[PDB]
């Protein structure tokens, strides 16, 4: 739990591949920390597209933290167009999600000034 | 000085990317959680 | 403040060189491709 969060948050990909072995218990994969942020949230927050792709290939469900954000909210707040492109090719249903204040990902991408996003 | 400031920004961003690479490649053994 | 900005640039360039040295000297074992 604690090692996987660090490895995903800082893009250490081989550590993630080692930890995510014997795929049978998805409780470790879809469990958030104290702020309710799953590994997918962290990997997208720091903009590591390879880790996001690897986690999605195991299925990560697109949950929500203690402010209603999703992976796309974080990726857009940061401006990392590549992990956004990786996310937008899976379920294609998270594009129009809302947080606690009814903000979409577009709201954040525009508020922070990321033109390409 | 606006031109100088823009060049400074560009260099700082390249440096930030290098540092993130360092963190994602380094060795961590004794200080692991 | 132009003089100050030039000194800032000089220091940042020295720092960039040091970081590149770190990357080219470090140990990489578990995170190798």
UniProtKB/Swiss-Prot annotation, chains B, C:
Compartments it resides in: Cell membrane
Annotated residues for binding of a 1,2-diacyl-sn-glycero-3-phospho-(1D-myo-inositol): 1-6
Modification note: TRPA1 activation by electrophiles occurs though covalent modification of specific cysteine residues in the N-terminal cytoplasmic domain.
Stretches assigned to coiled coil: 1-25
Highest taxon of the lineage: Eukaryota
Complex formation: Homotetramer. Interacts with TMEM100. Interacts with EGLN1. Interacts with the scorpion wasabi receptor toxin at the same site that electrophiles but in a non-covalent manner.
Function: Ligand-activated Ca(2+)-permeable, nonselective cation channel involved in pain detection and possibly also in cold perception, oxygen concentration perception, cough, itch, and inner ear function. Has a relatively high Ca(2+) selectivity, with a preference for divalent over monovalent cations (Ca(2+) > Ba(2+) > Mg(2+) > NH4(+) > Li(+) > K(+)), the influx of cation into the cytoplasm leads to membrane depolarization. Has a central role in the pain response to endogenous inflammatory mediators, such as bradykinin and to a diverse array of irritants.
Pathological association: Episodic pain syndrome, familial, 1: An autosomal dominant neurologic disorder characterized by onset in infancy of episodic debilitating upper body pain triggered by fasting, cold, and physical stress. The period of intense pain is accompanied by breathing difficulties, tachycardia, sweating, generalized pallor, peribuccal cyanosis, and stiffness of the abdominal wall. Affected individuals do not manifest altered pain sensitivity outside the episodes.
Record remark on domains: C-terminal helices from the four subunits associate to form atypical coiled coil structure; this region is probably involved in binding the inositol polyphosphates that are required for optimal channel activity (in vitro).
Family to which the UniProt record says this protein belongs: Belongs to the transient receptor (TC 1.A.4) family.
Protein name as annotated: Transient receptor potential cation channel subfamily A member 1
Organism name: Homo sapiens
Upper lineage: Eukaryota, Metazoa, Chordata, Craniata, Vertebrata
